[model samples]
Target: AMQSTSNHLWLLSDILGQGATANVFRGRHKKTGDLFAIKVFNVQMREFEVLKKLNHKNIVKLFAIEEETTTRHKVLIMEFCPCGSLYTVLEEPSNAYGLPESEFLIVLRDVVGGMNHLRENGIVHRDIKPGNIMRVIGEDGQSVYKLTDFGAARETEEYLHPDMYERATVDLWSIGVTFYHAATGSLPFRPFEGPRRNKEVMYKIITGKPSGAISGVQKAENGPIDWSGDMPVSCSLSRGLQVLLTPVLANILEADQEKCWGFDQFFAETSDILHRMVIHVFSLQQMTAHKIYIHSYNTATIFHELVYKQTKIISSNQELIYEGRRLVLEPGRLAQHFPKTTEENPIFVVSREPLNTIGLIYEKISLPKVHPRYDLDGDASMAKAITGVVCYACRIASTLLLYQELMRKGIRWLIELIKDDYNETVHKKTEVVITLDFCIRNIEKTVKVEISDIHTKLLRLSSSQGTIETSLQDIDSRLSPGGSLADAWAHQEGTHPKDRNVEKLQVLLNCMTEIYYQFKKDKAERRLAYNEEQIHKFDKQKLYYHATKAMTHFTDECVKKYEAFLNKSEEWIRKMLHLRKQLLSLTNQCFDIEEEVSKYQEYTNELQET
Candidate 1:
C-alpha cells in the first residue's frame, strides 16, 4: 500500500495536522525558499495514485512522491496550502454552526468541479468530508478551494466503493452530507456519537430523511421527513446561492439508493447555483451591520446567544427585520425568503420591542439613526452618470402629469405638496426625518382672496346704479316715454313699474349678474371643502392602526422584496391623518357659505318689490 523513492529533496519543518495514516508537515526545499506540504504515510495510499492521475484546477496538484529511508515511511511532496482544510476554518468559534455564505460557494464550486473531474477520469472518492477539502490563496491573492486527501478514494470503473457492495451512490451520498455541513456547520444526520450508539443508529441513519431525522427527535419511527419543515433558511445564506441548496441536497441526500442523484444531476444542479451566486454578504449584529469573510455563517447559535445575553428575544419576542420583514433563525431561511444582490448593502432592523404601536435601534450608536453620507456629485455609481440625468427626467415627468390633472379643485392644494417634494434640496439633510411639515392637513385651507374679491365686486355693483340714469335718457330718446309718461302709480303694463323708476331696473339687473355668479362660486367653495375632507378622511380613518400594523407585516411579510413593495404602499398611512384636520377646517367654511348663500335669494326677492 506504500510507495517509495530514493532521491532526497525537501526537509520537513512544521507539523500541519493528522491525516489518514500519519502526520502532514510543512516542508521547505533545500535550495529554493519555496514551501510545500509533505504528508508522511505508514502504508501505501491510493491518494498518491489519485493525485497523479488527475490534473485540474479544482483538484489538488501532486508535486512528487518521495520517501524517508531512515524513518521508513512513504512521503508525498504535495502542493502546500497554508490556509489548511475546510474543516479547520469551519470549526472557528464564529463558524461553529457552519461555513459562511461565499466560503461555502468556494468550497461548493471547487468540490463539485473536482468531484466531476474525478468521475470523468473513472475514479470515485469513496470518502468526501470537510477535512478532505483544502483552502489556498491563489497567486493573485484570491482564495481558492481544492479537493484533497484521496486516501479513501478508489478506482470505480464501476464507480463503486472499494467495499464490494459499495455503489457510485455512496460517493454522491458522502458529498450530500458534506454540502449540508459546509452550508449549515452541522451535520444533517448524526444519530450516533458515543460508544453507547448501537447498530440501531445505523438503521436510523439508513432510514432517516434530512428533513426531520436528526435536526430533532420525532414522535414516530421513520415518520415521513417533512423537508420543508426541517430545512430552515439559515445564515446570511438566506440571501445567496446556498438559498437554492435545499432542493439540491434533497435530491442527493436520499437514503433510498434508487432516489439518489448520480454525478450528472449533482454536478448539473450545484453548478446551476454557481453563476447565480455573488460575493459580498453582511450580518446585522446588535446595532451594527458588518461584512463577513464567509458569505454566510450559520447565525442560529449566534442568534440564540444574542437572545440569551440581551434577553431581547424572550417568549415569542424580538426580531430581525430586513426591509420591514421579520426574520426567522432557520437554515437558508433568509436566503430563501429574501434574496439579495452584491451591491445592495444588506441592512436589517432590530427593534426596541412592540408597544402594540412602535420601533428603532440603529440610532443609538453615535451612528445617530444610521446617518447616510450626503454630498453633491456623490452619484451612487459615480460611474457614467448619464443614467442619473435620465432618472431626473423621469422624476420631473411624474411631476408634470401630477400638475396637469391637478390644475384645479381640491387637488390644487397639491401644488403646495408638490412644492414640498420639490423642496428636496438638501439643506444638510438626507433621510433623517428632518421635516417639520408632517403635523396636519393642507387642502382645507383655500385661496382666501376668492371670497374677499367677491366683496369688491359687490361694492362696484352698488356704484353702477348711477349709470342707470344715463340709460333713462336713452329710454326717453326711444320715445316709449312719449307714448305714456309711464306713471309709477298706474300699472299700464301690468304688475311692472314705469320707466320713471326704470333706473332701479338698471340697478337690479346689474346686481343680479353679480349675485348669481357669486352664488355659484360660493356653492363650489363649500362642496370643494367637503369633497376634499371626505377623501382625506377616508384614508385617515382607515389608516388609524394601519400605520402601526405594518410592524406585523414585518413578521408576516412574504419576502424581502414583498416587504419593500409594501413599504412604498405605506403612502396610504400618509395623507389620511393629514386629512383629518381638513374636515374640521371645512366645518367652519361650510357653515359660512351655507349661511351666506341663503340671504342672497332673500335680498334678490326684495329687489323685485322696488
Candidate 2:
C-alpha cells in the first residue's frame, strides 16, 4: 500500500499472495536502492495483530502499517522474499519431501535453517506445514529456502507483547510432521489408502476414526528414496546415503520440546548425520536462572523452599517456560533513569517474585519495561497507588471468604447425604466462624503504606496537533438546543437558541447544577453536607453504582475513539454467542460422530480383512 514516502525515497509495487487475510506486494525505495515487501490486509482480520508484532527469521519481517496498532486491520510493508512458497512447487500428484535424497536434502536444509533461526529468536512456527516454507530466489537465480508465511507463528512472552502462556510443544509437533514429509516425499500424517486413493478411508480418518498414523499401514505415498550413489552436493545428501535411520528417527520423534533439541541442536545433529553439511552456529546461550535478591522474610523462605525443592521454574531461557511456575529473565533494566517516553525493547520480570533482583541495566542490548513505566513518579502519585493496594487486599479477603463459605456448604451437603450410623463418628459442626482476630493482629505487619516526599517535577504530557478557539457569535451554527437530548447529543441548536446554549460542556453542567440546587433549596433539602456526600459519590450506594456505570461508559468512549473498537465490539459479541453454541455442540459432535464414524470404519476395515 505504501507508494512513496513523504521524502520521495521509495516506491511500493507489485502484488504477491491474494488471500482473505492479507495481500503482499514488492516495494523499493527510490533513493536507498533497497527493495521491500508490502502486505495488504482487509480491515476485517483483528487477529492479524498476532503476526504483525512477532519477529522471527523463519517468519517474514513486518515493517510498518498504515493504521494504528490496535487497528492493524489494514496494510503492512515488509522485507520481500523473491522465492515463492514450497506448496506451489511441492504439493502435487507426487510427494516432494519424499523425493530422492539429493532433492530432499536441499529442501530439508532450507526448512531446518529457517526453523533454527526462528527458535533462537524465541518465536515458534506453529504451522510448519509444507505450505509455509518458501524458496527465495537469489540474485543469480539459485533457490534458497527461507521460511515465510508466519501467520500461525506464536511469539509467546519472549517478544514485547501479551503475557500469554503459549505452548512451545505445538511447534515441536509441526516440526515432526514437516521432517517426516521431507524425507519419504510422503505425507507422514496422511491415512493409508489404495494405489491412487480411497473415499471411505478419508471420511473415516477425518472424522477421528483409525487413520494410517494410528493404524500400522504405511503407504509409499512418495516414490522410493533413490539412495543411488549421486555425488553429494549438500551435506544432507551425504548423510542420507550413509547414516543409520534409527538415531535419526529417535531425535525427530523426541517425547516433547524439552527432550527435543531445538533448531540449533537439530542443525548440529543434522550436520553430523549428513556427514558433510556444516553451517556456522550463531553465538548462542542456553536458558538459565538469573539469581534474584529477596527482601521480605516470609517471601525469602518461600523462595528458598521453591528453589531447593525445584518447584519454581527457573529456566535458561524465559521463553521456553510455561504458566504457573516462576521464571527469571536476564539482561536487567534497559531505560533512562526515568524515561519520559515509552521504550520499544522488552523488560522481563521474574514473575510471581516480589524481590527486585535484576536491576535495569543500560548497555548495548537495552530492553525497556512494557507499560506504565513507573520510574520517577513522586509522593502524591505514590499515595494514589496506595489507595488501590487496600482495594486488592479487600479482593483477596473477599475471595477467601467466598471459598470458605462454599467449603462449609459443601461439607454440610455431604453430611446430610451420609447415613445416621456414619454421622455418629463425625461431630455436627454448624457454627464455623473463621477467626479474623489473628488476621487483624498480623495486618499491620502484612500491610505497609509509606508515602514520603518522593515526588519529582511534573512534565507536561505530549501535544502534537492543536485545536483552535471559537467566539460566542460563532456558537449559533455550532451549539445545540438542550430541551431535547437528541438535539443536545447531535450538537444542534433550535428552540434553545445559540445565545442560551453553552459553547462547552462545562458551561452546560454549571447551568444544570445551579438549576438543581435552586430546586433542592425550594424543597428545603439543599445543604453543604449533602454536597459533601454527593462529592464522594460512593457515600450513597445507589448513586455510587450509577456513577461508576457512567465512568465505565466514559472508558468505553475512550475505547471507541478508534474505529477498531467498533469492529472488535461487534466481533466479541458474535464470538461470545458462537462460543455458547460451541459448548452445546462439542459433546454431540465429538462423541456421537466419533462413535458413528468409528462403527462404519471398523466394519469396513473388518470386511477388507475378510
Candidate 3:
C-alpha cells in the first residue's frame, strides 16, 4: 500500500526499525532493485531541514524527500546500512569486557571527528549514543560509522543546560555517556525502568554522586573519583582510562557544565591518546622498514595521523607524531632523498607493514625481453614454434644471468659499507663509528631502493610471458580433432574440401585484420608522443649499467665525505683538549710561587722583631 502511494518508484519490502519519531522500512528501486531505507516521519520539519543541509562522511546521507498525497507524511530516503547500529556490536556478550584499547580509541576518534564537524556547523546533536550511530560502507569500501537520529538535534543556541550548559558542553556530556556504555556495556548513571525513574536519572545527572564515590557528601568532594563502576573488571578500558584518558572521561561526565571540557580540550587530549596508542602498538620491524622506504622515493608529502593499525602518510601539509615526539621533515629534503615524478609509474613497495614514511619507488628501467609472438601450438610449423620457444628461453636466461651479476656487485658494495679496519685512537674510533652509523643508514636506503626496483622489474618481465600461456589454451582447443574446424580439415582432400577451407581462411583473415587494428590502437594509447626512433635509440643494457654504477658511486662518495669530516672534527677536538691541559699547568705554577712569596715576607718581619 505504501509503495502504491509513491507510484511504485520505491518498493517497500520489509520493516527495518520503528522509533518514537518515525517508522523505517527497507526500500528497493523499482527498476534497478538497489536497496535503500525509507523513513516515514511524524511531521517534523526541524529534522528535515537539518538532514537536507548536512553532508558529512560520519553523518547519515539523505537521498530524497517526498510527501504522500493522501496522508501527507514526509518520506525520507536514506542510505541502507547492513551492519546495523553500533549498540548491538558493543552489547554482544563476547565484547562485554570492552573492545581492545586500540580498537576502542579508533571508534572514539571517528565519533569525535563526526561530533567536531557538527559542532563547527553550529548543530548540537542531543543524542550521541550507540543506538543512534549506524555503520555503512564508504565509497572507498572502508567501514564508516555515521551519527543518525536527528529527532533530538537542535541549533547550538536553542538548548542550554539548566544550570550552566553551553551547547558544546551538552554534546560532550552525551559523548561521555556513550563512551561509558562502550567501555563497560552499561551506562555510567544507572537508568531504571519505572515511571519515577526518569526524574531520578535526571537528578543523578545534575547532582549525582561522582563515579567511585560512596556517600552523597563524598560525591561532592574534591578527591579522586573512582571510575571502576563504569569499567569492566578485566578489560583494557580501565587501563586506557588510567593512561591519559581518565581526565577526558571525567570532563565528559562532569556534572558541572562549567567545568566540562569543550571541543578544543577534548580533541587535543584524545588526539594525544590516539598518537600514544599508535606508538604502543608499533612494531620494531615497521620502524626498520623506514630505512628502505626512505630510499624507495615515495611521493607522500606529509605524514598525517598515525593510528595503531597503520601510519597515515598524506600528500601535503601533514603532521607526523611518534612516541609523543613530532618529527617534521621538510618536503624538499624528503623529496631530495626519495625523488619521484609520477604516481602511475609501477612502484616497488619495500615494506608490507604500515608506517608514516617513504617506502615506495618507481620500478627500475628494464629491457623487455623478446617473447614468442605466435602461439606455439597454432597454425605455425612445429619446427618454427620449437625454435622460437628456445630462442625466447635463451634470451630470458641471459637477462637473468646479467641481472644476477649486478646483484652480486651490489652485495659486495654493501659489505664494503659495513666492513671497517680498526682505528687506533679511541676518540677517533668513536667519532668514525657514529658517523659510520649515519652513513650506513643513508647507504642502506640507497641500495634497498635500487635493488627493490630491479627485483620488481624483473618480476614484471617474467610474468609478462603469462599471456603466451593463456593463448596456448585457446590454440589447443581450436586444434583438437573433435573440434568442427579440425574435423573439417581432417575429413578428406577434394574439391568440396578446398572450397570449405577457402571459406574458413577468409574468416580467419578478417579476424586477423581486426586483431591488427586493436594492436595498433593499444600502442597509440601511449601518454607521451616522441620523435621518430626516439624510443628505439634507447638501450636497456646500457641504461641498467649506468644506473647501477651511478648509485654505487654515490654511496662511495657519501662514505668518503662523512669519514673525512669525522676525522677532521676529531683532530680539532684533540688540539683543543691539549691546549686546555697546558693552560691548567701554568696556572698551578703561578699559584705555588705566590704562596712562597707570602711566607718569605712573614719570616723577614719575625727576624727584624727578634
Candidate 4:
C-alpha cells in the first residue's frame, strides 16, 4: 500500500509514522510546491470526522481528503509537522530530566489550550499521550506543538456520564500521566498482569503515593536540601518546579472521577503556572505610583517614536526579506514577519533588551505606507499627490486599528502573566496599573482625534459643493428667455426678430447655457440629500478637486471671452461656441469623477471589512 500509485497532486516524500489503522506520510504539492502530511487510513475512522470539524491554531489543520477506488481506503491530508512527535523529544537524553522549566510550561499551555477547545466542541481526545502530540515548524521556523492522532478521541457523552465535567476527567487523567512521563522519563504507574489488570492498575493510581507528596512532607519536617548529589536528575525535582507541578498532578490523578480536575481547572492552573514562569524570568517588580507614571510616560514616548520611524520605513518602499531572500507581497505576508510566542523575539520581551529594541519587532510588522513620497508644494498633480495623502491617512487609521487589537491581546496575556505574582499588589497598586492602561488609551485617543479631523474636512467639502451648485443654477436662470441673454438668441424662424444676427446669438447662448447647467446638476447629487449608499461614497476631498477644476476651467473660458460678451459684439457668438465645447468635455469628466468617488468608497468599505 505504501508503494501504490495514489494522487498526482501530492507526491509522497517520506513515511512519517505508522499505526494499526493508518500510515502517515510527508508529501508535497506539485503545483504549489508546498509540503504537507498525508494520513492513509486502512479503514475509515472517527479521527477524520473529529479533526475536520476543528479550526484552531493549537491544532493541526486537516487540508483535504482522498479515497482510493480499488481498495476503498480513505486518505486524510494534513499540514506537515517537521519536528515529529513530542514522545520522541521527551525520549532524548537532554530532556530526560524534563525540558527546561520554561519550555515545559509552554508545552503545557499549548496542550491545555487545545484541550479546552476540544472540550468546548464536546469531544475528548481519550488518547492524550506524548506520541499523540506533534511539533510543527511555524512560519518563523520555530517549533509549535500541536495535538494530533484523534483516532482514539470520542464524543464526551459517548462512554461517560451525561455531565460534561465528569466526561472530561478521563482525558484530564491521561494528560496528567502524559506530563508525568515527560518530566520523569517514566510512567507514573506500571501496568499490572491478569484479567483484572485494568482494575488492579486503577487501584494503584488511586491508592499509591504521589511522586513529591512523601518527599515534600519529609523535607519540610526535617530540613531543606537533604538529597544526595548522586540522585539522578530524572528522579529529583527542583523545589520551584515542584511548587507548580505538585498541585497539577494531585488534582488530575485523583481517584474519584468526580474529584478529578476538568477543562476549566486545567486551563486556569496551566495559564497561572506559565505566567508565574514569565514573572520570575522577567523580574517584573512593583513600583510606586509616581515612578510607574514616569516610567509609563517615558515608555509611551519611546513607543510613539518607534511607531513613527517604522511608519516611515514601511512607507519608503522598504523591501521585506526572510532568510536573506526578498518576499513577494500577498495576503498574510505581514503575518509571516511576526515573531512567534515560543521564540526569543515574541511581540513583547521584558528581560532581554533595551526598551527601544523591544518595539522594533512591532514596527517591522506594522502596515507599510501606500505612498512612498509625497509633496504638497504642488510638485505633483492634485489628484495623484492628494490621493497619496488621503491614502496615507487611511493607512494611519488602519495601523491604529490593528495596534488597538494587538494591545488588547497583549494586555490580557500580560495581566494573566502577573496575576498570580501580584494578585494582591494588582489591587493595591491601582494607580500604577491604571497608568499603564491610560498609556494605551492615550494613543487610542490620538488616533480618534486624527480621524475626527478627516471626518470634519469631509463635511466642509459637502457644504461647499452645495454652494457651487446654487451659483451655477442662478447663472443659468438669469441667462434664460426672461433675462439679458435671451435677446441674443433666435426665438423661432420668423417670429419678431429684434435683429436676425442677435436672434441667432440668443439661440446659440441658450444652447450653451443648457449644457453648462446639466453638468452642474450631475455634480449636485453627491451633495444634495445623499442616499445611504451614495452618502458613504461621497468623499469631500475628491469632490473639492472635481468642483475646483470645473469652476476654474469655466472661469478661464469666461475671462477669455469677457470683452466680446460684455460689449454684445458679434464676436461673442464665436466665443459662445468655444465655451460650449469646453462644457461638453467638462460634463464627461464630471461623470468620471462621480465613478471615481464610488470606486474609492467601495475600497474604504473593503478596508473596514479587512
Candidate 5:
C-alpha cells in the first residue's frame, strides 16, 4: 500500500525511441552521477502511480516522477535502455538475427516472470506490446529486455478502467503478436479500427480457430495490412528452443481466456523447463569433458540427488575409480562441470542396481534420508522448492562462465572498463556522472510547476466513482415488469375492452406528464450554476459524473422509446421489422436478424389477435 516517491524528482532528456504510453527520455541527476530514462505520459489522461510501483526484472525500473519545462509534461524517471527496445531491434535485422537461443529464452522468461509478478500483485499490465519492451545490453554485451512504459497500465481492481481485462486481452494477444514478430518480423494483426476492436482480432486465435480462419481470409497476406515481404525469415539460434516455445506461444495466441495460461502458471512451467534444459546441458558438458581411464573391477556407490536414484560400482584394485554417478559412467578422470568431490563422493558408479531396498546404492548412487541439503523424497514438507538453478551463487558462477566465454570470443571491452587506474574506465564513469548531473539539473529546471499537477489530476480521475454511479443509474432506469402502468399492460394477459384501451391512453399521457416535470426540474437545477467553484474544467470527477449521468439519461430514454414501440402491441411488427430494420441497415452489418425476447409483449398481442 506504500505510495511511490517518484514525484519528488525532476525531468531531463528524451529517449530517441517511441514507447506506447510515455515518451521516453534519457535523464540525469543534477547533483549525483546517475543517468535515467524519463518517460513522459503522452495522453495526459493516465497517472504514473501504478507504473511507479512496478519492480520486476523485465520491467523498466521507475526512479522518480518529475515535470518538464516547455511542454509541462509529467515526466517519469526510469532506467535507460542503451540498446533501445524490441521494436528498435525489429528494425535491425542483423541484430535481430544475431540473438542467441539461450538469450531469446531468457528474455521470454524475464517477460513472463515480470508479468507473473505483476498479476500476482493484483495488477494487470493491460498493455504488453513490443514497443513497451525495451531491449538493452547488460554489463555483459547481450540483449536484456525490460518491459517499459506504464501510462496505459492500471491496477485490475480499479473501477473506472478504460476497458475490462477480458476485453483488453491485448496484453496476451500482444504476446502472440510479439512472438510472431520474433519469428516472422511483422504484426499478424493490425488495428483495423480503434485499438480495442483491432485487438479483438486476436479472439480468432483464442477460440481454437486459426487467426486466418476467423474472417475466412489470410490476414497476414491480405491487402489492408500490406503483410508483403515484411515478415522475419530467420534467427541465429537453433530451432530447438523455438520448437519448445511453439506450443507455449500458440497457447498464448489462442486468445480464448479459458485456455489461456495465466502468467503465474506460465512462469512456473517455463522456469521448470529452463531448469531441466540447464541440467541436461550440464550433464552433456560433464560427459564431454571427462578424461578416459580404464579402472580395475571396483564397486563404487553413486547417487542421483535429484530423484534419489542410486548406482554402485565394485573394483578389485586401486588402479582406477569408476567415474560419473547414475546416467554417466566413464573411464579415466571424472570431468567436472560442478565442483570436484570433497571427502566422500555423494554419487559414484555402482556394480549393479539394488532391489527391494530403500535409499540403497546399487550401480547408481543414492544418499540416505538423513542427507543434509538434498532430500530426493516425494515428501516436500521441509524447506523451499529446490528446483532450478535458483541460487544467486549459481547465477554469479554463470556470470563468470559467461565472462570467460566472452573473453574467449575476443571481447575485452568489459575487462578494460573494470581495470584500476584505466583511462577508459575513468572516462566511462565520468560520462555516467556527467550525464546524470545534466539530466537531473534539466528536470529540476522544469518539473513541479508542470508535471505533478497533471499526474495528480489523472490519478483523481482514474479512481473516481462517477462512472460506476452512472452505470448503476442506467441499469436502474430499465423498465421491469410490475414497476409501473406500462409494466401491468405488458405483463397482464386479461382481455382488454374498448374502455380499457381508453384507460391505457390516459395512463400513458399521465406517465409522459410526470416525466416532463422531472426532466424540467433537473434541467433548471443544472443550468442554475450558482457555485463558481464547480465550474473548473479540470474538476474531472465532477465533469465525468455529469457526463456519465447525461449519457445514462439518454440511454434510458432510448430504451424507453423502444419499449414504447413494442408496447404498441399489434402495430409493433411494422415499426420494428420495416422501419427499424431499414434504420438499422444504415449502420449495422447485414447479419441474420432474429427475434429479441424483449418483444415478448408484442408476441402476446399477436397471440390474442390469432
Candidate 6:
C-alpha cells in the first residue's frame, strides 16, 4: 500500500469541542486557506484505519493525519462541519417544538445513509448522541447531518445478540434515543431531578411504566419514566411523521433484546418513513410552496387532488413533475417514488401532460448484501467447501511429488558421504523440494499456534471476569436495602444494634472502590496489542517457497493471521467501549453509596445528641 504524508502546515482558530481523548479545533491551511476540522490529542490507530477504508456520504471525511509543529501534537485533519452539531441546532427556539419536517428529513436521510454504511462494514457506533451528529450545509443549501466521533465504536461479523452480546443492539438503542430527541424536543427518558440521574435513565431503559410500553417525556418535572409511548404534545414533526416515528421508536427502544428489531428489521422499517412524505407543491408559473401529505398506500394521483386545492387548475388539467421527472400518477406507483420525494424537490403543478411510464423506474431498491457466504445456522458455505477442496489438493500434490522425489533419490540415498560430499545438483534438488514442504507446513503450524494464543488469552480473560462479577454482586447486595449497611441504617434509625457498623461499612466502601479500579484494568486489557512483525514474517517466507495459483493460496494462510488478529482486536476494541458505557453508570452508583453513608451517624443522624 502507498502512504501519503504532508509537512505540518495550518493555523488553528476556534476550539470546536473536546473529545473523550482530544480537543477539536477549526483549522485553516496557511497557504490554501482551505478550512479543516482537526482533532488534536492522540492517534488511535483503530479510528485512523477505520476512517481510511470508510467511503460513504453520511460519515465524516478524514483528510489527513499529521503532527503540529508547535505542540508536536498528533492532529487528525477532517472535513469541517460549518453547521455545527444536531445538539446546537436543536437548541434553536424555532426547533423547541422539534426539527421542522424539511430539516428532519435531511437529518434522517444523512444518519440513515451513514449508519447503513457502518452496518455494512460490521461496525457499531456505540455513541449516537446528538452532539456526535455533526451537520453541514449541502449543495442544495439543506442541512445534512453525519455520524461523527467514532471514539466509542466497535466491529463484528456476527449480527446476532449472543454473538456481539447485544453490542449491535447498542447502536439501535442509542439511535432510538437520538431520533426521539430529534422528533420530540427532549429526551424520552430522564429523572425527575437534574442531579446524578444515570440510574434513573438506566432504570427507565430497563422497565417503562404501565406494561406493554416504554417510558417517554414528562409533562411535569416529576417522574413519568414508567410513562407510556405517547408523542408529547410539544413535538412539531407533522402528525403523520409522528405516526412514522412511533413504531420505529417502539421496536428499537424495546427493553427486551428478544423483542427488539434486529439490524435487518430496523433498516427495513426506517426506510418506510421516507415514503411518508410532506411533499411541497410549487405552482410552475408563479412558484409558491404548499404542503401536500401522503401515506405510503396513497397513489401518486392523490397529489392531483391535493395540488388542485393549492392552485386554480382543475384536477384533470394539472400534472406533477418531481426532480424533472414526469409523475407516473396511477394506482400502483406510490411505492416507487413517494419515499424519494422531499420538500426541497417538490412536486410541480403545471399545464396537463402525459403520465410517465418509465420516468421513475419501478425498481425496488434493495438492501446491501452483507456477508452472503454464511447463513444464520453457520452451515459451511460454498466458499468454505471450496477452501476444503483446495486443502485436499495441496495434500494430493504434495503426496505425488514426495513419491516422485523418492523415485529420483532411490540409489542416491547411499551417496550422503556423511555431509562431506556435497553432490551439488541432487542435494540442491532434494533440499528445494523439502524447502517448499517445510515452509508450507511450518506456516500452518505458526497460524494454528497464534490463533491458539488468542483463544487461550480470551479464556483467561473470561475467567478473571467471573471473579470480578462475583465481587461486584457481593458489594451490590451489601449496598442494597436488606444488606448490612442498610440494616445498620434502618435499625440505627431507631437506636438499633450493630455497634461496629461504621467500621464495617468502611470496609465495603474500600472494597467497592478497589473493585472499580480493577474494572479499569479490565477495560484497558481488552485492547489487544497489534501483531505486524509476524504478519510480515511470512511475507518474505513465501518468496523462497515457490508460488503457483494453488500453492500461493495455500502459503498465504500465513498472512491470513493478520486478518484474524485484526478482526478479534476490533471485537475487543468495541467490547472495551461498551464496558466504559456500563462502568460510567457503575461509578455514579458507587459515589451514591459513599455519599449516603458519609453524612449519617450509624443511620439518619436524626438527633445529633440522642
| Global lDDT of each candidate | 0.44, 0.35, 0.44, 0.44, 0.38, 0.50
Evaluated against the true structure, the overall lDDT of model 4 is 0.44
- Clashes, model 5: 50
Clashes of 3: 1
- What lDDT does candidate 1 reach at residue 196? 30
lDDT, residue 503, candidate 3: 36
| Local accuracy of candidate 2 as per-residue lDDT tens digits, 1-610 | 4444421222333656666655566666555667776555544345455556766544565666564233444566676665566655443212322344445666666666667766665555455666676666656665666666654322311110011121244464455545554554344334344413543333333233221221123345533222221121211222223233324434544433355545556677666544432211000011112222222222323333333332233432122111222223233422122112111111122222122221111111111111232212221222222222222222222322222222222222222322221222112111110112222223333346221111110001001001101221122122223211112211221112232211222232333333333333333332346554443232223222332443343233322222232233233223323332333343233333334333332232223354
Note the residue pairs that clash in candidate 3. Answer: 293-359
Model 6, residue pairs in steric clash: 209-226
After best superposition, candidate 2 residue 339: deviation in angstroms? 62
Q: Give the candidate number with the greatest lDDT.
A: 6
Runs in model 3 with CA error above 4 Å?
Answer: 1-13, 19-21, 43-50, 138-142, 152-167, 190-206, 211-232, 237-242, 275-277, 280-610
TM-score per candidate: 0.44, 0.31, 0.41, 0.38, 0.37, 0.44
Worst 10 residues of 3 by lDDT: 284-293
Worst 10 residues of 4 by lDDT: 285-294
Q: Candidate 5, overall lDDT?
A: 0.38
The alpha-carbon lDDT assigned to residue 290 of candidate 2 equals 25
CA-only RMSD, every prediction: 31.9, 36.2, 29.4, 34.9, 42.6, 39.1
Residue 358 error, candidate 6, Å: 42
Error of 1 at 69 (Å): 4.0
Cα deviation of 70, candidate 1, in Å: 3.0
Instruction: Residues 250-317, candidate 6: write the lDDT tens digits.
Output: 78776667777887877777776665556655443322345565665677566566566555567777
What TM-score does candidate 1 reach?
A: 0.44
Tens-place lDDT digits, model 5, residues 1-610:
1111233233332436445556655655666746676556653424457566667777778766666654666666778677777766654422322344465666677777777676676665655766778887777876678875544533311111113434434476567656655554334444343334544443332343453221112344222332222222333333334444555655654444666666566666577555532211111101111111111222122112221221111332111121221233333322343323321222222121221211101121111121233221211211111111012112222222322222211112211211221333234434443433343344445454345543444334323323433533332232222221122332232222322322332333333333333333433344434342233222223323333343343234422332342234323222212322332332121111111112221322223354
lDDT per residue (tens digit) for residues 333-439 in model 3: 43334323121111112122223321111122222332334222221222222222222222222322222222222223222221211111223323333433343
